[PDB]
């Protein structure tokens, strides 16, 4: 049993919001207990993981759940059945709040052939700190489905160039095709251009119990890395009459212009991003990083014959991984969020998040 391990992930989360068309605060604490067995010896290996989740309001117990995950392994192929945290282009579980969003399902991954990863899965339920079954975020939770089917392939053509295709199907609600092209171009010592191009095509599926689904999503992130600096531009475009479909539960839309508050995927929205990163290591402060980014959106469809909405958001994050002493490896994050829109809400918000992972064995 020496290959087994246990960890406890701790998250302390404080947010001060000023939302209006009101200054309210929130302090809370997350625990994620991860138990992972090793694998039963032999060609076909067997294992068992357990994931325990607890959210506490700051103290009153707010949310708890315990899930198990059976795992099988053979050569380069793995099957997991039970609690899952998928991080896939058509289902990228949320983890920017207190606790990670989880799913129950079965996920098969296989990397038998050099440079090729194949994925096939089915998710049956979504769980968040807030009566299950899945639906498009923003639509009728009464017209839900217990079956999300996914299949994918990623191929590294060269170590500079890889491509990905994924298919997501929420049975009887929607279908989604994803195409991604990732190109990294070296440009001299400490220099590289990362081109991250993404395309989603979303339509209805089966009985279409939540109504029509019409969205194509074109988005790209170009990132110039230079020594300890990084400079990025993002462009994103919603086409069709619908917002970009994601699974309910604040699942993260896998998109270039995703921000701390808004996703910039509203119906017909066109947006661009500027982002700057700095690693302070060279300056003598390893573990300290600055990220600041700004996204501006327009042409947001408000229907009828109304004027389109428009919006902007700025995010500034200062993050610090403590390098030594009793709190070594404790991570701190200060996030400043500023958001304005023409016809909707305005927001100012500060968050302070402390993360730490304790190894139990």
Author numbering: 3 to 23, 29 to 65, 86 to 157, 161 to 391
Task: Provide text from the study.
In such microorganisms, the majority of small molecules are taken up by members of the OprD outer membrane protein family. Here we show that OprD channels require a carboxyl group in the substrate for efficient transport, and based on this we have renamed the family Occ, for outer membrane carboxylate channels. As expected from pairwise sequence identities that range from 35%–50%, the Occ proteins share a similar architecture, with a slightly off-center constriction formed by the inward-folded extracellular loops L3 and L7 and residues in the barrel wall. The transport data demonstrate that Occ channels have a pronounced preference for substrates with a carboxyl group, due to the universal presence of a basic ladder on one side of the barrel wall.
To determine if the phylogenetic subdivision of Occ proteins exists at the structural level, we determined X-ray crystal structures for seven Occ family members (OccD2, OccD3, and OccK2–K6). The pores of the proteins within the OccK subfamily show a considerable variation in size and shape, suggesting differences in substrate preferences within subfamilies as well. For OccK channels, conductance values are on average somewhat larger than those of OccD subfamily members, ranging from ∼50 pS for OccK4 to ∼300 pS for OccK1, OccK5, and OccK7. OccK4 was indeed the most efficient phenylacetate uptake channel of the proteins tested; however, the specific activities are very low and, as for vanillate, high substrate concentrations had to be used. Thus, phenylacetate is not a preferred substrate for any of the tested channels.
